[PDB]
Amino acid sequence: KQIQELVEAIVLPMNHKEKFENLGIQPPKGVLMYGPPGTGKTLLARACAAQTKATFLKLAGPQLVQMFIGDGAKLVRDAFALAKEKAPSIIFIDELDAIGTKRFDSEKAGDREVQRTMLELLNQLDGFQPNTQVKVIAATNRVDILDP
Amino acid sequence: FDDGAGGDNEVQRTMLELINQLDGFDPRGNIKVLMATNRPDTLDPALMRP
Amino acid sequence: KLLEHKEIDGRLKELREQLKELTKQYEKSENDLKALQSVGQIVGEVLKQLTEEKFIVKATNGPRYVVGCRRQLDKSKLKPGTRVALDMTTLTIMRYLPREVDPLVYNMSHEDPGNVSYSEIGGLSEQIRELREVIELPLTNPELFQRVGIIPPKGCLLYGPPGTGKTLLARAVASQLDCNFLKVVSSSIVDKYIGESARLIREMFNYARDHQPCIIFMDEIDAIGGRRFSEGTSADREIQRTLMELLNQMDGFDTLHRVKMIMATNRPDTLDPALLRPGRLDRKIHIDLPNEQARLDILKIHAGPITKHGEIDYEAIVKLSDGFNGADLRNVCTEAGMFAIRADHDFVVQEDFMKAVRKVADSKKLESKLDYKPV
Numbered sequence A: 001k002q003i004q005e006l007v008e009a010i011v012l013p014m015n016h017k018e019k020f021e022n023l024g025i026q027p028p029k030g031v032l033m034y035g036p037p038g039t040g041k042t043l044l045a046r047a048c049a050a051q052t053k054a055t056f057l058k059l060a061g062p063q064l065v066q067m068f069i070g071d072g073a074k075l076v077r078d079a080f081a082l083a084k085e086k087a088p089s090i091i092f093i094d095e096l097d098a099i100g101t102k103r104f105d106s107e108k109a110g111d112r113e114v115q116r117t118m119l120e121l122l123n124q125l126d127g128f129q130p131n132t133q134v135k136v137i138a139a140t141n142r143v144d145i146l147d148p
Numbered sequence B: 001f002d003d004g005a006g007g008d009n010e011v012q013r014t015m016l017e018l019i020n021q022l023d024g025f026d027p028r029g030n031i032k033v034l035m036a037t038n039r040p041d042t043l044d045p046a047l048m049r050p
Numbered sequence C: 001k002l003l004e005h006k007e008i009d010g011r012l013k014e015l016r017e018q019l020k021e022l023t024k025q026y027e028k029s030e031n032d033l034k035a036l037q038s039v040g041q042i043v044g045e046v047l048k049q050l051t052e053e054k055f056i057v058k059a060t061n062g063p064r065y066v067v068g069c070r071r072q073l074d075k076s077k078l079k080p081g082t083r084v085a086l087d088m089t090t091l092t093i094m095r096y097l098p099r100e101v102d103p104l105v106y107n108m109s110h111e112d113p114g115n116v117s118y119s120e121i122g123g124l125s126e127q128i129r130e131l132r133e134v135i136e137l138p139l140t141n142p143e144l145f146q147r148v149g150i151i152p153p154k155g156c157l158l159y160g161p162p163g164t165g166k167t168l169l170a171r172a173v174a175s176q177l178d179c180n181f182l183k184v185v186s187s188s189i190v191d192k193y194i195g196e197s198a199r200l201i202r203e204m205f206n207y208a209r210d211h212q213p214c215i216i217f218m219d220e221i222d223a224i225g226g227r228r229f230s231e232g233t234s235a236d237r238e239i240q241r242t243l244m245e246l247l248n249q250m251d252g253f254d255t256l257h258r259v260k261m262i263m264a265t266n267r268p269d270t271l272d273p274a275l276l277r278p279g280r281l282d283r284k285i286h287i288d289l290p291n292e293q294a295r296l297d298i299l300k301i302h303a304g305p306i307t308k309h310g311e312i313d314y315e316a317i318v319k320l321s322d323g324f325n326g327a328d329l330r331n332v333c334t335e336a337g338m339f340a341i342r343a344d345h346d347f348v349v350q351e352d353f354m355k356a357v358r359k360v361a362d363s364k365k366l367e368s369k370l371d372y373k374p375v
């Protein structure tokens, strides 16, 4: 049933947008995987990369952690622009918790570009700039590290 | 180890970077790694996975 | 016979238009060369008014200075808090600017959508009328309350079910009224430098009171990612002092000009008794789930953008499903549309609705702790 939800709710927007238009509904924006770290999460994104050809895009988590500051937000915008160039956009990020952090409630210090890439990731992602050619894949180990 | 105190976390960022470049999405190859710990119950199940 | 006058007029047209347009772009780019007189400035913000002609500015990497104006830069405009452009050599103030900072205030401010009708799901019995009194009527006339002398109704709490009286069925009259409808999901106050909580309370109100009758709306009063503990270790007075400074800048000590509070939640566990006094939550209200005919309402408005035959049994979906959520009927419509996508039909048959009943109402039953009311 997870393969059902996966294929029948991501690959059918890749091939049938009008089938949503003949009925008068709208495909969801944002699909999230979570659970124990052994059930196979990366495998499903790789099965997407195999059995679909609509511009698979991996994105590793702590690669977005930057030191030359200002690069990861630009990089996410580059990723969506590049996958926009090949309009059906299979977009996957692993360890979203490694960039989407619970905003820590403490003083004196703090890495900043996690927040910058977080704000720009949610900006490029959804809400602001909506588009029906974003197919959001993400998988994490834990859920209670994340933001509402 | 993280709740509403917000202290030491950057080493965990380094270690998640280690997991990322270590295993999953084209791992090592002809590399054999031995690890050791006196404290197995302080490990992460992002490395306990076979 | 004299088309050489038009071979001269055409030479005029072509050659003069081309050379004049090349020399016109050369005029504007000689002005771009003249911009090698307009050679750079600095930008800082006025931190205070030192003397009437002096100001302390803020180099954004570092130190603080003493400046003046150019000559006539309106020294009353340059209040502490404005941003100015600073000179490069003389370092003094050249030109004022707008802006301000982090979009966690902004992305909850005016990302705020609206509903396409007052009846986005249904059940508008006390909703239209009492929300109308608590917002719109004393903003139209404060003198009626000035027969008594009190601020406008201090705001209900939309509690009850999580999703028919929590986030849905909250923006009914808000769609109609359209005055100062911002969002506060109340995770944006639990900050990093933990005393930025009260500063962003100031940033909430002192940015709000412009659209003069303000709508202070707060979904999910105590919201951060996860669940909550009890009166022991650190599930503690963050909420209490933060909420009392909220209530401080809401009413009691500081407010101004017919601002309407609206609280709307049932999720938080730890709340102030002084939150619960008449004067800050002077009136409160309750919402049922549906009364089974508001089920019929939310279904008959959820039976919207669906190609059908006009035979969809509303009584069967109303009585046979028990979701008690406009979002549940949203899932019903979604999966019934997917089961018209399945079997390849444009129309969503009533049996696709009952397939939605079965699958959606069974996956619905994978939830525990189906109850929420604070205190």
Ligand SMILES: Nc1ncnc2c1ncn2[C@@H]1O[C@H](COP(=O)(O)OP(=O)(O)OP(O)(O)=S)[C@@H](O)[C@H]1O
Pocket: A035, A036, A037, A038, A039, A040, A041, A042, A043, A139, A140, A141, B024, B046, B049, B050
């Ligand atoms: N259905 C399956 N069939 C075969 N092997 C599977 C299956 N599910 C999981 N696996 C195995 O489990 C591992 C894949 O899981 P993971 O690589 O951990 O996915 P994941 O994204 O890494 O999950 P986490 O939370 O990130 S560790 C590999 O060893 C796979 O061979």
